[PDB]
Design a binder for this molecule. Structure first.
Ligand SMILES: *[C@H]1C=C(C(=O)O)C[C@@H](O)[C@@H]1O
Ligand code: NA
Ligand code: NA
Length: 252
């Protein structure tokens, strides 16, 4: 296990780390979210950049990042543009996506970025090396908002993210059945049994999938998303409820 340390937080041992997603259409609403969010307890702040309207301006995006870092100087910060094809709020060109992600890395404002595996091998491997050259960690991610791939497919996808240099492979899948939820947990456990080189984030989305967000210490998901007031993805529960369950499981 190559654990990831960001500001005294160790991702990939002990209790799963709680992530909450900040969503703001503009700099003023990003600022008000950050002030409200630093009154909640969690391990990692994700800025969902795709919710930001003025995405065309690299500098406006960096101004918004700065307002979040100013509000919370010592939170581990994850810069995440979620593309619409993986369930995000808007479309941008690959080129603009890598520009924003490189801008974020160079800013020194963020500790981690999200790179979607399906961006394409050469673009991901180059952005990963770029992140790593500036000591920014990569959460390499895949989302399927429609169905749950087989356990084999999710294990090979997560190992693929490892091979392209992901610090923290991440997969989030929509169950169609309770069976699909088990499949995801099986996939998670298979990485813990057989492929435990990098911590991995797994989740089965929606109401049926919620157990996947609670059980990460047993089956080996290194982090889980709670909601401060709005959920960034369906099946997230209130961040205090999530912390309660995590602590009862760790201390059992
Ligand atoms: C990845 C996963 C999400 C989830 O299913 O909880 C939320 C999204 O903001 C993250 O980027
Ligand atoms: Na994704
Ligand atoms: Na999808």
């Amino acid at each position: 296990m190559k654990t990831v340390t960001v500001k005294n937080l160790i991702i990939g041992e002990g209790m799963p780390k709680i992530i909450v997603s900040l969503m703001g259409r503009d700099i003023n609403s990003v600022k008000a979210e950050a002030l409200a969010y630093r009154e909640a307890t969690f391990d990692i702040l994700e800025w969902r950049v795709d919710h930001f309207m003025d995405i065309a301006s690299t500098q406006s995006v960096l101004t918004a990042a700065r307002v979040i870092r100013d509000a919370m100087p010592d939170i581990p910060l994850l810069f995440t543009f979620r593309s619409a094809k993986e369930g995000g709020e808007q479309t941008i060109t690959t080129q603009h996506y890598l520009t924003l992600n490189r801008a974020a890395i160079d800013s020194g404002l963020v500790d981690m970025i999200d790179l979607e595996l399906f961006t394409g091998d050469a673009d991901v491997k180059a952005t990963v090396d770029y992140a790593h050259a500036h000591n920014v960690y990569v959460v390499m991610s895949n989302h399927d908002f429609h169905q749950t791939p087989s356990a084999e497919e999710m294990v090979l996808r997560l190992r693929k993210m490892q091979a392209l240099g992901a610090d923290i492979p991440k997969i989030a899948v929509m169950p169609q059945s309770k069976h699909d939820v088990l499949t995801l947990l099986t996939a998670t456990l298979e990485m813990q049994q057989h492929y435990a080189d990098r911590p991995v984030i797994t989740m089965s989305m929606a109401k049926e999938g919620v157990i996947s967000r609670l059980a990460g210490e047993v089956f080996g998901s290194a982090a889980t998303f709670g909601a401060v007031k709005q959920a960034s993805a369906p099946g997230q529960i209130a961040v205090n409820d999530l912390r309660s369950v995590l602590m009862i499981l760790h201390n059992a």
